[PDB]
Amino acid sequence: STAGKVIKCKAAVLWEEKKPFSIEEVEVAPPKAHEVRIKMVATGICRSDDHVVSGTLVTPLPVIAGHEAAGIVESIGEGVTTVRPGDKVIPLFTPQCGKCRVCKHPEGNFCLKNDLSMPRGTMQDGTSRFTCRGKPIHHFLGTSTFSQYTVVDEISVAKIDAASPLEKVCLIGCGFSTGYGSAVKVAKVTQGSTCAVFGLGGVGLSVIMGCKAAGAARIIGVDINKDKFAKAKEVGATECVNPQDYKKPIQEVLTEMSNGGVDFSFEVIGRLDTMVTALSCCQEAYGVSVIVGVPPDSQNLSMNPMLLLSGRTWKGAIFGGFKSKDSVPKLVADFMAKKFALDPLITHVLPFEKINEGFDLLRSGESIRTILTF
Amino acid sequence: STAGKVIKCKAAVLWEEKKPFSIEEVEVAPPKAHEVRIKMVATGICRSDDHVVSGTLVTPLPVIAGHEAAGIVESIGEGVTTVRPGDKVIPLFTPQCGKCRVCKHPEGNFCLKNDLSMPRGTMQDGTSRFTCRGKPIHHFLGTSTFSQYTVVDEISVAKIDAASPLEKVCLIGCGFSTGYGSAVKVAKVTQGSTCAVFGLGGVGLSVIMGCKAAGAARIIGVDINKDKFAKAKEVGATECVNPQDYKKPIQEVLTEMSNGGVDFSFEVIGRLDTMVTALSCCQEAYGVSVIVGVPPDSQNLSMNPMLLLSGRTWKGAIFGGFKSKDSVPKLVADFMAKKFALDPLITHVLPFEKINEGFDLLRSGESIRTILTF
Ligand SMILES: NC(=O)c1ccc[n+]([C@@H]2O[C@H](COP(=O)([O-])OP(=O)(O)OC[C@H]3O[C@@H](n4cnc5c(N)ncnc54)[C@H](O)[C@@H]3O)[C@@H](O)[C@H]2O)c1
Ligand SMILES: NC(=O)c1ccc[n+]([C@@H]2O[C@H](COP(=O)([O-])OP(=O)(O)OC[C@H]3O[C@@H](n4cnc5c(N)ncnc54)[C@H](O)[C@@H]3O)[C@@H](O)[C@H]2O)c1
Ligand SMILES: CCCC[C@@H]1CC[S@](=O)C1
Ligand SMILES: CCCC[C@@H]1CC[S@](=O)C1
Ligand SMILES: [Zn+2]
Ligand SMILES: [Zn+2]
Ligand SMILES: [Zn+2]
Ligand SMILES: [Zn+2]
């Protein structure tokens, strides 16, 4: 019925940094060749969407943010072969073209068609499908899910199980997969190890889930908000520590509690100082530290290279190291088979029109993941 | 004949920073329990010994430096079980106690008894076996090989093949093992990969040897001294580049020549800026960069954590990651079986008494390894 036509719908537009989202009427153009128009069903509020509002994450404005979501294909442009109208799908903020050097490498996942390194906030063809008040509105990492309808490139969408609960599996579009993969795929947590997880929001909780699934014996959660500790323990943290309770630096405290440094540490916050602290708290000769948190745009950290010369391994990853199009469908299938849980991350559910309230909950420290329904 | 007695012999003592070594008479005490007194046969001049002179590497002075060497056991203290008088041995600047958490971990080699993290420059018992002009002289990483005789702890010595040529296998005590292991063990260079090696001294040449033995397809040598290029090519470099020949930063140049960044990069110099440049030139999603070079004491580098967040792996190692006492004897055995060559690193041979001349050759850029004979 709407196939091949402009759709007029509501979307949350961010017109300028540090302002509330504006629920407005936008026009969404029909999908061009190899493009997929999606009717959104659920979208999570991730800290990275708030980074766009705060200026932490820089991307051309005005913009329709949102990148963690699930929806139903409304229509497909010419040449699309991987999804059909009616299919449940999850948009991929990291594409999987399957032809670049990274897509062909066994460990790479940061596809070279990404819109993160040199952000333009467009479709792959350099143009936008969004218009508001007559003005073109940018996309966000080829996803833009804070809208009733969006249009993505075929390499930025994956078909998922037809029976999946989209108000839950939207978390596989970012939060869950990032945390879980960070532990299980990037760090490769080992059985019996000691892990330290800095930041106990949705991503940090999914890191804990992954460490516990990998058989870690000790999983130490670190947060300055102690209200985060109960849920952290629920999904696997054996201990939790608040840096504000101590008179000495947390890396010392953690080095002492792990009898010389942890096997695996994770930075899941987004601060330069906690990135260096997480590196330091892993065992100097064989420790591994993974950066997951997004740092303030263009800022450099300072660190002593002797931390690495002793033997430490330092790495970072986008989306838990998962090749997005190949893994999203398998993660949904595993969720359907009850291999992991997603309810522990969901603390609040709000209609899409209350998006600003959902961001207020995140910023106040009260929520983990707010799921917005359309 | 000398067993149980103080030995009077010549040693090169460093009384103060930035001065020539002073060839003096020293008194070497007999070995205490679990100690081994070694008659030196050959010692190489590594850049790290020059770092002690320049103040780059800090350790208590006055000191007997030198750590890359081979000699013959003169006598053993009570309780020594792993070596005997007359054995050929190689002193280990990284110990292998075999009991600490690092020694027992499969991938650790930075034994907790090392004298590097908090340098005291003494034997394991906190005292020195060296005296000069009535003053106690410090040890250097439990080795101190710029002396006709030295005393080391049993965990800092390995028994090697009785037929090995000590004027060649002394390089297994540092230079060769470090570079080689950095490629094959730490980085785990893969067949068909592209490697970039910053610094073409003896350790950088050894890194090339390990990349070639791992089957790398391309091995790009980087050095501001183009006189280093011929030998680099001889041992495996497919191309060599001098940063001074270009108008743009070397990481750009290397990213362009590897069509998007190399698989494995190695910092084998000891500069903060080349450590970051080496990291950057490795492929942003799956690249691996290994720091081998020793940076100026207590200085921090500055870097953007986005270099890691895209997927890069950054690591460092001491002694190429080898568990010292288990690996040195195998390396010598491999060398005896012609599994690798050591002659390409040796450009000059001088009597011990010309140690200052040997340091002048290194500092002028003329040599790779000068072997000193006793
Ligand atoms: N690499 C990726 O692919 C990817 C994917 C998703 C999110 N992220 C990033 O991961 C981070 C975490 O995301 P989230 O959605 O879980 O966010 P969140 O805001 O829900 O969680 C962060 C947690 O850090 C805690 N915290 C803040 N400052 C702290 C400090 N100084 N010390 C200790 N704890 C502190 C907060 O109390 C909070 O619980 C963000 O930076 C987000 O942008 C990266
Ligand atoms: N990690 C360890 O276990 C270990 C063991 C041995 C040596 N090291 C360290 O490794 C480094 C190399 O040792 P070496 O004995 O081979 O030293 P070296 O001095 O023989 O070689 C260093 C090479 O780097 C080159 N170089 C200098 N500045 C440069 C720049 N700006 N750009 C590019 N190239 C530059 C020089 O021309 C030289 O050929 C030293 O810092 C040494 O202390 C570490
Ligand atoms: C390291 C920067 C990654 C930014 C990505 C934005 C959407 S997802 O939350 C992570
Ligand atoms: C990272 C510092 C290691 C310094 C050690 C001194 C002797 S060997 O050259 C390496
Ligand atoms: Zn790709
Ligand atoms: Zn996200
Ligand atoms: Zn050395
Ligand atoms: Zn040990």
Curated annotation (Swiss-Prot), chains A, B:
SUPFAM superfamilies xref list: GroES-like, NAD(P)-binding Rossmann-fold domains
Residues binding Zn(2+) 1, per UniProt: 46, 48, 67, 174
MF terms in GO: all-trans-retinol dehydrogenase (NAD+) activity; zinc ion binding
GO biological process, one term: retinoic acid metabolic process
SMART domains documented for this protein: PKS_ER
Chief localization: cytoplasm
Reactions listed under catalytic activity: a primary alcohol + NAD(+) = an aldehyde + NADH + H(+); a secondary alcohol + NAD(+) = a ketone + NADH + H(+)
The EC number(s) this enzyme carries: 1.1.1.1
Binding locations of an alcohol: 48, 67
Subunit field text: Dimer of identical or non-identical chains of two types (E and S) coded by 2 separate genes at different loci.
Protein name as catalogued: Alcohol dehydrogenase E chain
